[PDB]
Amino acid sequence: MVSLPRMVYPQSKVLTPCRKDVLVVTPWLAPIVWEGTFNIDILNEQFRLQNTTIGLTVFAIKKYVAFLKLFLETAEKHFMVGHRVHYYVFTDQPAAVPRVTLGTGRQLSVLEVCERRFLSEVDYLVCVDVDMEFRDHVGVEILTPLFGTLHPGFYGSSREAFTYERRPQSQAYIPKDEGDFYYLGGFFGGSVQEVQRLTRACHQAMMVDQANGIEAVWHDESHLNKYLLRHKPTKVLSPEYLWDQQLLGWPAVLRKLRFTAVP
Template sequence: MRFFQKTKCTLKCLLWVPAALCALYFTCSSMNIFIGFLPMEKCTLEKGKLPTLDNSVDVSLDFWSRTDVQTCTTWKAPIIWEGMFDSKHYDQNHKKEGSSVALTVFAVGRYLDEYLETFLNSSEHHFMVGLPVSYYVFTDMPEKVPHIDLGPQRTLKVIKVQRHSRWQDISMMRMKAISDVIESDIRHHSTHVFCFDVDQVFTGRFGSEALGDSVALLHAYYYHLPKSFYTYDRNPKSKAYMETGDFYYHAAVFGGSWKSVKSLVEACYQNIMEDKQNNVEALWHDESHLNKYLWLHKPSRVLSPEYCWDTQIGYRSDIQVTRLLWAPKQYDKLRTP
């Protein structure tokens, strides 16, 4: 009997080790530095073999220019890093093909005052410059949306949404709002959609090299970690439940063709509502459901953490440029009723 009790205790301790190390990782800068030395898997695509192509210009991607990082997935989709692509070549190709982009962002409650103006102004300087861009700002206070001087071929629409008392509900219900606006408006005007969290700032080119049919983002805090540390939802009662996956994706940025994004957000919304009916809430809310969907429906394009970086992580030799940065988080101030 004592043997079984000791064994049970030991197993519990072992199960807590990954969680404890993850907590240490997020709070200890020295641990962040150490994690940066853990090698990533490498692209197994042979030279001369074609990857999964989102468009003809992807043939020009140089998968062997970055030997320090993983540049393709096991299903041969590209992982986009600085040094792999010719930006002018991509821009010329997408202009020729008539690509246009809808950007959705939610600024509800105090998030509007704190982040929206900086987000939009920085986007004007760095996001899809040279392509038609339509901003869709979802907010509970349309009258407070700041005036932004927009460049040529760039428009902004404000859509009023209900403010929920819990930030988790705001985060999850955006899936339904995005689906609705794609159906009613975006699909008639834009070839692609990108969905962003508002508490971010563009700092470098976030251009047409990021466009694809289904686009996911490697989470900056997990891309060097072993899969056993990924914080997937482990509750079998949730529709977001996962035992394993390919990567850990960040819900702060996702995109693709309007058809693919509509399919993603509709599936996530349906699963969120089914969880609600069963009194279940996924561990990381819409991000948990996003990860489950992208495991079942592999993205055709993956963005490196350059496309959403947190300076709190510290120096990483593989991050040669930062294109979008996390803004300082003030959860105690912004998430209180």
């Protein structure tokens, strides 16, 4: 709750949009995070004064443990640098986790495969896929009670084309005339409380489907989209936050490619 210190930065013009090529705010007034929309110095101050701790979770089972080295190494260079970070690696191969050198204020926990511990160790949880690498800044601008990320392959598509689950028998069902955006199952997060609510809701929904003998078209991602349709995220991250350059190139609307798939 402490006041920010004196800071010097250019004034923002009220009669000048920051981006004229993209939507920077949703209909429910949640910002859509694109490069140019935020002053990272102001945001860093706000979150540091709060002594914010960010938890980053990844699952690495079977062959996916081979992606951990690059993932963690690049995270050390681009993820929440300057803030307290706690990595949680869930794996079936504890002894296979690479020994990565971490900067100060950052720690790593290996969990072999207790929601209460999250509430006690971190303020925010970020959940992502491990077969990726950070290529640019991914900082506190993403922190909020609940956020989803615009899928790189559908940010420009009409909702009818969104690959939501379309069968009424599934708990993840979303009709052709509903839907705001198509979010990624591989990059979401928010406060520990909101994240656990989302995962708990999706777990229950998937069990109901299982009992009914049906599996959503895109599994977890399908349910996450249904959850975020009914519980609007407080921030939405642009595709800058999860991209595949090999498959999608580098469009003009993307000033930075922050987190990407590994070729």
